[PDB]
Amino acid sequence: EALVDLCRRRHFLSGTPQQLSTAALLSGCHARFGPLGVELRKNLASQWWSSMVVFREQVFAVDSLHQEPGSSQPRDSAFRLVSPESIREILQDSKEQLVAFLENLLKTSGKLRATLLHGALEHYVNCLDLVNRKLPFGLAQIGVCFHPVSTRVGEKTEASLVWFTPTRTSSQWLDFWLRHRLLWWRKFAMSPSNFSSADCQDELGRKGSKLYYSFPWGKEPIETLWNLGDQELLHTYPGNVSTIQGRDGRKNVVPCVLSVSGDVDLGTLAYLYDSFQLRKVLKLHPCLAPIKVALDVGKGPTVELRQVCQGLLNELLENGISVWPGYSETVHSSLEQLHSKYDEMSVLFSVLVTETTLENGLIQLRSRDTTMKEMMHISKLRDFLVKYLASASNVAAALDHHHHH
């Protein structure tokens, strides 16, 4: 409970006490994140987009509606979208008509999506043209999906990659992606071993794999990879099968479909738990930590020190480095209280500007990781930070192009 409490306290998480139970956190029935949490999730999403889309020339972005055509025939559980008017129009405005009306709702009402797969399949022919039918290629999208709880509606941010490839290399690609995705979660982890995988198969015998994170109450699947075959793709283009073929060298084939879907929200919670260390400190990876640095003032002329801090902030923000402007506060807290709070907020570095600074331009820099302080000239702070971050980011990008198996 210490982790969730700290997170709610420091605004990584949001919600009432009833909304902070493990069940409520996993249901997705309420917006789980506070500002610092939204920032962390945004950074995670960015890292996903860089590794899966930006750095892979065969992967394109796709966007699809949150709502899908109504059917009800299959008897699925997706929520239906019903116009309040139509309901009012039949009410205040027979018994056999009411039943007919209800029958209509079920059969014709649109529904909220449960996965991002269909959005990709629907845009497959378009991307086929974009790449001149050359296989393999993928469609990526990060978006919210809905799922029924217990009658509550849960919302989950899904990160999806749908990979179209000839059947003959489908097995190898599934293995390539499983390895690539596992290493992606681990490069940001304090305890990489807490991120694991397990192979599986579906009711139809199709192979796939799942990635898990070991939460205190057990392992939860944060990502799944499935080798779906061509069934769903074929069903998406009835009567046009002859024209949805891609090129596998000199051969034309209906591609096999690999679906890779990660849960960004659960993944964000995963890093929060993974970063918690005992002084309570959250050691989120430098690329994920919402706030990179904090600027505060020590003893000395208020207005002048604040001015120096303001210049430093502008310079950092201009470099895209997030900054917590602690010097703006009433600052009636001790140094120990300040550092303990920053440690809980996962602030990478805290800087202290004082009278001395006005004299020899030196500032005190405290590292969240080691908690060791040290002097440095205010003119070198930007360079140190920019470099420290690039180095962390470069280490994490070590194997982004490694050819697995």
User: What is the distance in angstroms between the CA of the first residue and the CA of the last residue of the chain?
Assistant: 41
SS3 state at 361: coil
Residue closer to a second copy, measured from CB, 257 or 321: 321
Phi, psi at 276, each rounded to 5° = -65, 120
Breaks (C-N over 2.5 A) in the chain follow: 93, 150, 278
Span 238-297, contacts to a second copy by CB under 8 A: none
- Residue 323 touching Na ion (CB under 5 A): no
Are 319 and 386 a contacting pair, CB within 8 Å? yes
Residue closer to a second copy, measured from CB, 34 or 262: 34
- Residue 73 touching a second copy (CB under 8 A): no
- Residue 281 touching Na ion (CB under 5 A): no
Task: Give 129-179 as a DSSP string.
Answer: HHTTTBSSEEEEEEEEEEEEE--EEEEEEEEEEEEEE-HHHHHHHHHHHHH
Least Å distance, CB 212 to a second copy, is 24
- Residue 59 touching Na ion (CB under 5 A): yes
Span 109-128, contacts to a second copy by CB under 8 A: 109-112, 119, 122-123, 126-127
- Residue 76 touching a second copy (CB under 8 A): yes
Least Å distance, CB 240 to Na ion, is 26
Residues 367, 373, 377: CA angle, nearest 5 degrees: 95
Count of residues touching a second copy (by CB under 8 A): 86
Of 23, 102, 375, 390, the one binding a second copy by CB under 8 A: 102
Partner whose footprint covers residue 14, from a second copy, Na ion, none (CB < 5 to 8 Å by kind): a second copy
- Residue 103 touching a second copy (CB under 8 A): yes
- Residue 42 touching a second copy (CB under 8 A): yes
Which amino acid appears at position 135 of this protein? Answer: L
Span 254-273, contacts to Na ion by CB under 5 A: none
Distance between CA atoms of 30 and 16, rounded to whole angstroms? 10
- Residue 54 touching a second copy (CB under 8 A): yes
Which amino acid appears at position 246 of this protein? Answer: G
Binding segment for Na ion among 11-19, 49-57, 196-204, 384-392 (CB under 5 A)? 49-57
Are 160 and 127 a contacting pair, CB within 8 Å? no
